[PDB]
Design a binder for this molecule. Sequence first.
Ligand SMILES: N[C@@H](CCC(=O)N[C@@H](CS)C(=O)NCC(=O)O)C(=O)O
Ligand SMILES: N[C@@H](CCC(=O)N[C@@H](CS)C(=O)NCC(=O)O)C(=O)O
Lengths: 207, 207
Amino acid sequence: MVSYKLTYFNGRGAGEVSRQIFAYAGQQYEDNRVTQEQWPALKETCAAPFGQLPFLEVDGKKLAQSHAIARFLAREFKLNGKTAWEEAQVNSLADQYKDYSSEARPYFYAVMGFGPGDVETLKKDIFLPAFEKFYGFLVNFLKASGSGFLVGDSLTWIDLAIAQHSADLIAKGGDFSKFPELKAHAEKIQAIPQIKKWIETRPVTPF
Amino acid sequence: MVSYKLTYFNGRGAGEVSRQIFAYAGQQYEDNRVTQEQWPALKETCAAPFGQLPFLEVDGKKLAQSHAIARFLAREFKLNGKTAWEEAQVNSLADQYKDYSSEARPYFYAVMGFGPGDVETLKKDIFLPAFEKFYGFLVNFLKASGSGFLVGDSLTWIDLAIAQHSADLIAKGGDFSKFPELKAHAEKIQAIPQIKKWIETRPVTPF
Ligand SMILES: N[C@@H](CCC(=O)N[C@@H](CS)C(=O)NCC(=O)O)C(=O)O
Ligand SMILES: N[C@@H](CCC(=O)N[C@@H](CS)C(=O)NCC(=O)O)C(=O)O
């Protein structure tokens, strides 16, 4: 019927939330994964609206930007929030999640390989202050909603994105003593059957 | 009888687009501009959801994050796109605009007196490459829409935001030789009567 194709690198990363949205919705899509080695020719192809991944094609029309794609798909499948106000709070938290990711990027770059710096020092000087600030806000949202979801009484795509990040940190030995609520959040979201099923079946990748 | 209150600094900055959405719509709101002397105080207060401005109050309920606010307000006033696909595209460009703003930030901060470094050097090494990349994407959007607006055939909030950025850069001595299209766009959007009136009456601030 409507045809979806998601183009991203062969990894979870910024595409993953859109894949998880499709899984919850039970929507068929083409998971187009591009390798490091293939990217140059695709980039020269001018396919990507801003020269970057991910991008989504909906009946061949192109949409860039990870969060624009996630919001677009979540609104189609009723995962963006149950009222206008909830949609906006979801957006607020997702944008604050972007600011966390910018603050933490020097650490994640050194850890992954892509950048310079001593990892122990960046952990304490850059990652932990960023993580503690942002996760304190997550806990505020959990307490406000009172449901176990970040916004309102049901699942939204920011739950999926945040649960995936938390799961990744935990798997690498991250200490959640300050935020046991987010450990519980990550377990809760990743047990939702459609999501558990996707996690069990997706390609295994380092990121 | 929904009551709106916008809290931001005494400047255009990240609050301005919301003020312009309200001006376009003819919607009364409280334009709450915070002084250096109030701020530390309001910050200590946990008034702001994430400790930062802007935030919007809607019958007393708080919403943070400049883009989340603009999107919430634009959707209430039909300035976010006329179809779900236009709303996504507005979202995609607005997010690329955030990426540009992040790349240019070292320069903007130096000019504003918030950050280190030599303005002349930052202008050419950091700002101009960012500006030229992003404004080339703006031209692609204008050519695709075919109407003089960035997305589709009528005004959206990203027109307001981009026109105001362009008008500021031009006013302050910027060279738009490479992008005559965006100077025309700025002139068109800033001549809209509600907008022209707001520009002539708002507090005059450097930023
Ligand atoms: N604001 C963007 C960032 C996009 C982005 O940084 N993409 C990277 C992911 S590795 C990329 O495609 N880099 C390859 C390149 O710029 O050639 C988004 O959220 O989708
Ligand atoms: N992602 C943000 C950033 C908000 C922001 O950086 N606010 C600055 C504006 S000057 C601020 O409130 N700084 C004062 C402070 O952090 O105490 C948004 O778009 O609203």
